[PDB]
């Protein structure tokens, strides 16, 4: 079959080691990357906010919040995400590029609920979610992108957000 075929990198702008890298906010079994306060337009051009999710335990809910275009006036005018089918389709490193790949084929036993919580599990609804299996044998890393670097508000520019989900063997 087929589920898309694109190619991105960690950037598409500038910076490579000036990346603001932080861990996800982990509450019990919920690991959250919330970009609703990281991607607003700022004077120092486009920053890159890299949220690192490290899964070392069974049945972790990974939740990702991306500010919706138009949710506030202006600040998210040109916001777009990496994989449009973000829960079911992810990005994987191939040397220097990130290409699309089905998540269920990457990790066996992925429980993708079609209804996140009364809404459609898709970045169009602002939030995606997926639960990791009880057993993972090989370390697997996949990526998500919430890019607001195109949005221009004032004399500053928005930021590009990166989620790195590192599923460790557990």
């Amino acid at each position, epitope marked *: 079959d087929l589920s898309y075929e694109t190619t991105e990198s960690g950037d598409t702008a500038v910076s490579e080691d000036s990346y*603001d*890298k*932080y861990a996800s906010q982990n509450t019990n079994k919920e690991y959250v990357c919330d970009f609703t*306060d990281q991607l*607003k337009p700022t*004077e120092s051009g486009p920053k890159v906010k890299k949220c690192e999710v490290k899964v070392n335990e069974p049945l972790i809910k990974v939740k990702i919040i991306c500010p919706l275009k138009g949710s506030v006036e202006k600040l998210y005018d040109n916001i777009e995400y990496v994989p449009k089918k973000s829960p079911y389709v992810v990005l994987t490193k191939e040397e220097t590029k990130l290409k699309e790949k089905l998540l269920s084929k990457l990790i066996y036993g992925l429980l993708i609920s079609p209804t996140v919580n009364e809404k459609e599990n898709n970045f169009k609804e602002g939030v995606i979610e997926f639960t990791l299996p009880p057993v993972v044998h090989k370390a697997t890393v996949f990526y998500f992108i919430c890019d607001n670097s195109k949005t221009e508000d004032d004399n500053k520019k928005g930021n590009r957000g990166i989620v790195e989900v590192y599923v460790e063997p557990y």
Partner: antibody
Amino acid sequence: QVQLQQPGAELVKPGASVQLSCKASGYTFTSYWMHWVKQRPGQGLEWIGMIHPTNDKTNFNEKLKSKVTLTVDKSSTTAYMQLSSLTSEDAAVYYCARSLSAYWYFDVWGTGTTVTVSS
Amino acid sequence: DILLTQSPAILSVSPGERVSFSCRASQSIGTSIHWYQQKTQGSPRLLIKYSSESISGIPSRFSGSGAGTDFTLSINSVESEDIAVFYCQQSYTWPIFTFGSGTKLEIKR
């Protein structure tokens, strides 16, 4: 020319209410949140709440919401904080401050009203 | 709950040295930290927005940094006019905001 003007003092009797005022000037009032910050004599800043002038949308820290009411008069670009049933614990300096849109920092702060609760 | 910790309560340098105030969050909050300066009997003054962005009229010797949990406001070549209390503020829990307990900066000649 941005200005947030606050009265110097308010002497309140125990159990009475007080109306604090924050007169804004020199900017577009309807484009900014107006926050209220409490500072007891020699201590730290304590965020209380905020209000947006257009929709009258208010957000409070639920620990102090029971006693606070926030109000805006768009005609005179003035923000008000109502405080009820005051006690000695309510005596402090109360600053107003503004924040633009969803940029959640306080760039312009008011002069501050020293509130005293005594008979 | 997100909790901020500023240590120590009192920091002392020398006129010209490098000062740095620590603001630690109890959970990772990206770059949702903001710094303020309050001088004696004065209103707080915004020094740094979103961890490391300079403000319009702040001297260039005021710099912040940090992502996630540990944030640092630094002053290279500290003057004596910088004597005040420094508060950090988090916005990750918007629309609820909190301040750190503040770190006082003194100078000893």
